[PDB]
Amino acid sequence: MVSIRRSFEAYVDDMNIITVLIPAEQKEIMTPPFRLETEITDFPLAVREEYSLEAKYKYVCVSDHPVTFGKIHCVRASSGHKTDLQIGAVIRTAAFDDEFYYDGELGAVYTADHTVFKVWAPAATSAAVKLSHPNKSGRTFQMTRLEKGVYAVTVTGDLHGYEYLFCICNNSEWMETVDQYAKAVTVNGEKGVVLRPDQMKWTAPLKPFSHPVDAVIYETHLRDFSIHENSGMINKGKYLALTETDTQTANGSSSGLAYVKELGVTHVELLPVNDFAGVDEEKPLDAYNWGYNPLHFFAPEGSYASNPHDPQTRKTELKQMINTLHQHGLRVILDVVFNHVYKRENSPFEKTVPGYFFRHDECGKPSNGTGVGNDIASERRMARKFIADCVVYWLEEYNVDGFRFDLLGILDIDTVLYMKEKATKAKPGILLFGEGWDLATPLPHEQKAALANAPRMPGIGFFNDMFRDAVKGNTFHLKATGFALGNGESAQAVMHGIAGSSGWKALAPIVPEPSQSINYVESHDNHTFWDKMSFALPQENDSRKRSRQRLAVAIILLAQGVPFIHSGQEFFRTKQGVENSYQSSDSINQLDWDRRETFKEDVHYIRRLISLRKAHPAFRLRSAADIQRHLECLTLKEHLIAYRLYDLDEVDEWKDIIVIHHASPDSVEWRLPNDIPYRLLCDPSGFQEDPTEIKKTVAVNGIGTVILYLAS
Ligand SMILES: OC[C@H]1O[C@H](O[C@H]2[C@H](O)[C@@H](O)[C@@H](O[C@H]3[C@H](O)[C@@H](O)[C@@H](O)O[C@@H]3CO)O[C@@H]2CO)[C@H](O)[C@@H](O)[C@@H]1O
Ligand SMILES: OC[C@H]1O[C@H](O[C@H]2[C@H](O)[C@@H](O)[C@@H](O)O[C@@H]2CO)[C@H](O)[C@@H](O)[C@@H]1O
Ligand SMILES: [Ca+2]
Numbered sequence: 262m263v264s265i266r267r268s269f270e271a272y273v274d275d276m277n278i279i280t281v282l283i284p285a286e287q288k289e290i291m292t293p294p295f296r297l298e299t300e301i302t303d304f305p306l307a308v309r310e311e312y313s314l315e316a317k318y319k320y321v322c323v324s325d326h327p328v329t330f331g332k333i334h335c336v337r338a339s340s341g342h343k344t345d346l347q348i349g350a351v352i353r354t355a356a357f358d359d360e361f362y363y364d365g366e367l368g369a370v371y372t373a374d375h376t377v378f379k380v381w382a383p384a385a386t387s388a389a390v391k392l393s394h395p396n397k398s399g400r401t402f403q404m405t406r407l408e409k410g411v412y413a414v415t416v417t418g419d420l421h422g423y424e425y426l427f428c429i430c431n432n433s434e435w436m437e438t439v440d441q442y443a444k445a446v447t448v449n450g451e452k453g454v455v456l457r458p459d460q461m462k463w464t465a466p467l468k469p470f471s472h473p474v475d476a477v478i479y480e481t482h483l484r485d486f487s488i489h490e491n492s493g494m495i496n497k498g499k500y501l502a503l504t505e506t507d508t509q510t511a512n513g514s515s516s517g518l519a520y521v522k523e524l525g526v527t528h529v530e531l532l533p534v535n536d537f538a539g540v541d542e543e544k545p546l547d548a549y550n551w552g553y554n555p556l557h558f559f560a561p562e563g564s565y566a567s568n569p570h571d572p573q574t575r576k577t578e579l580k581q582m583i584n585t586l587h588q589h590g591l592r593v594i595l596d597v598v599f600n601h602v603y604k605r606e607n608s609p610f611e612k613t614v615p616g617y618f619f620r621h622d623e624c625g626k627p628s629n630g631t632g633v634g635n636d637i638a639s640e641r642r643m644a645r646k647f648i649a650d651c652v653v654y655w656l657e658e659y660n661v662d663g664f665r666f667d668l669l670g671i672l673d674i675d676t677v678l679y680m681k682e683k684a685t686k687a688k689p690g691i692l693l694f695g696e697g698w699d700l701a702t703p704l705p706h707e708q709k710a711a712l713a714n715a716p717r718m719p720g721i722g723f724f725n726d727m728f729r730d731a732v733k734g735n736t737f738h739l740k741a742t743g744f745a746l747g748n749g750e751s752a753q754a755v756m757h758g759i760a761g762s763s764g765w766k767a768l769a770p771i772v773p774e775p776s777q778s779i780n781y782v783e784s785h786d787n788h789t790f791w792d793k794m795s796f797a798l799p800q801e802n803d804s805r806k807r808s809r810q811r812l813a814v815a816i817i818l819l820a821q822g823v824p825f826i827h828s829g830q831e832f833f834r835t836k837q838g839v840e841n842s843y844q845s846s847d848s849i850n851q852l853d854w855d856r857r858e859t860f861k862e863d864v865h866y867i868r869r870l871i872s873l874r875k876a877h878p879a880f881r882l883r884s885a886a887d888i889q890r891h892l893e894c895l896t897l898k899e900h901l902i903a904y905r906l907y908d909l910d911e912v913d914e915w916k917d918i919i920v921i922h923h924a925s926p927d928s929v930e931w932r933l934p935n936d937i938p939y940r941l942l943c944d945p946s947g948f949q950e951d952p953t954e955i956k957k958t959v960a961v962n963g964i965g966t967v968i969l970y971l972a973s
Pocket of ligand 2: 459
């Protein structure tokens with residue numbers, strides 16, 4: 262690293278403390294007293310303490326007046342030498358935050374007449390906006406510093422179509438960067454772009470969603486969903502593929518939009534659509550990536566658009582896709598990544614205000630609770646502002662219906678409750694949830710938005726890994742098995758999950774209310790359910806495995822809480838044994854519409870389970886108190902579980918409902934709790950056309966589920 266030649270060093274580590282570092286073989290030359298100078302300034306600096314390091318001697322000096330940011334400062338030694346005051350740790354202090362917190366809008370504010378530019382850089386000494394445009398003369402103008410450390414400049418003319426960059430001067434080193442609030446960018450996100458309002462109109466009004474336990478989530482990646490040669494869609498792997506109506510596979514099976522609507526799902530959860538790194542937008546087929554490498558939080562990814570060179574195109578297509586799903590009665594959830602950025606050192610945050618936006622350990626080095634290099638410090642006031650500003654923007658400008666927070670456990674509770682307030686006001690009924698794993702990040706345990714603190718985050722949901730592992734088997738030991746795979750040691754944990762995970766017997770509650778429990782058995786992370794089971798049960802044929810996976814679905818789909826499904830799970834999706842496919846090729850990640858064809862019958866079974874849940878509110882109790890009054894366990898053995906829903910007058914259309922889950926191939930007899938005749942609605946074979954009546958006892962033959970009901 263080349264660098265500015267300096268006599269010695271000096272940093273501002275607090276609102277009134279300056280740390281002076283002098284090189285070893287100069288200790289006797291560059292000595293105290295020291296003085297802080299600037300235009301019209303010259304005060305003395307007292308020494309509180311001094312001690313030697315391994316290459317330098319250090320002084321911790323104090324000043325009578327608080328340093329004033331925005332102007333260049335000079336530190337003078339008795340020997341006459343000088344050096345420029347650099348930025349220290351003062352940026353992470355509460356005193357600094359309170360002094361510079363800005364509540365207005367930031368970024369590029371457009372008008373056909375003129376454009377106003379604003380950026381928050383409280384510790385810088387200068388700033389400028391750099392404008393360019395293909396064949397149109399480039400210009401760079403100096404910005405003026407205002408209150409709260411905000412720099413701005415107003416440029417006359419219509420700037421639609423112009424590219425822009427900010428130049429921020431920190432520690433006498435100028436850096437170039439795109440606007441953190443950029444709403445449009447060039448190919449591969451090299452620069453931001455100014456664009457007039459696109460005047461997009463939303464023509465598919467949807468009323469506020471009734472309640473969380475009334476939803477059915479379907480997780481999918483935009484490229485995976487339609488890249489297969491037999492997807493029946495024209496815009497393969499693009500935003501527009503999901504807009505294509507009445508699409509079908511070669512053999513005539515339903516696909517795309519028509520397919521998702523037929524299944525009965527209510528919300529479609531998409532993997533990251535903000536601009537990320539990992540795929541060359543100029544040559545998208547050369548690489549693949551899930552999208553968890555944030556570059557620009559306020560703009561869309563380019564590889565999913567028809568044309569990534571025209572700044573407006575990607576925006577238009579994402580909005581059309583979303584509007585179209587709305588027209589067909591489907592809602593949208595956005596996976597968002599506010600816990601880290603890709604390459605911290607080159608990020609807009611770091612180049613504008615060095616060291617402010619990332620958490621640090623006691624040594625003064627970036628923490629790594631995320632495990633990928635950096636942790637965004639949500640607790641800083643402008644960071645919290647940013648996250649809330651971002652969530653509201655997507656809601657207002659893209660009209661989505663909820664968010665899935667990646668690594669929710671890294672964010673702080675106050676920031677989460679603050680954005681929740683603003684988001685629900687902008688869009689009543691949206692869904693808000695995430696993974697609240699306990700992670701090693703520098704925050705007191707009670708301040709993390711982790712699962713353990715669910716009681717303090719009402720209105721926020723969490724992925725239920727307890728229920729997940731109980732049904733499938735521990736996901737960190739390939740060979741481990743769960744109830745669905747034949748392990749009776751976890752049957753009680755399963756009953757707990759069926760009851761909404763809000764307390765059972767001597768088992769402590771996972772969450773306070775069912776609306777906070779996202780029940781699932783598969784996701785984009787780890788082995789798919791089919792692949793994991795294939796490793797744990799190496800001696801079982803395909804027929805038996807299929808029945809165990811259908812069993813895992815019935816357990817989840819008929820449980821109290823919020824059901825969540827991984828795209829392709831319905832037809833035993835496989836990834837060739839790959840455990841972490843974040844960058845694998847298409848042959849590994851694509852949604853196989855050939856397999857959806859082969860197992861149309863098993864997909865039909867899932868479709869019927871979703872229809873049942875929808876037609877009977879008994880499977881959708883609104884609170885822990887109500888569940889306590891209408892749900893009770895009847896039988897609980899190593900391979901057999903039976904519970905029932907009762908007292909369903911005002912509630913359900915049926916009077917009594919009994920559900921039996923069997924996890925072994927043998928055949929057994931089960932005694933009903935009474936002698937009244939019931940209707941056999943379903944058994945290990947599947948649903949029955951025109952229910953037959955049985956009395957006192959019923960047979961449970963092989964792996965599967967049997968459902969009995971009594972009408973009114
Ligand atoms: O290139 C940077 C980074 O890439 C790799 O990390 C990726 C993980 O391997 C991959 O599993 C994925 O992880 C994310 C989960 O899918 C998501 O559910 C949630 O848990 O967030 C995770 C990360 O934020 O994505 C990451 C990032 O691309 C590689 O392993 C790292 O060493 C490397 O630093
Ligand atoms: O054309 C600009 C922008 O307009 C709309 O966004 C509005 C939003 O509807 C209002 O509620 C309020 O928040 O102001 C926003 C911006 O002015 C569209 O929703 C959006 O797609 C479009 O880009
Ligand atoms: Ca990109």
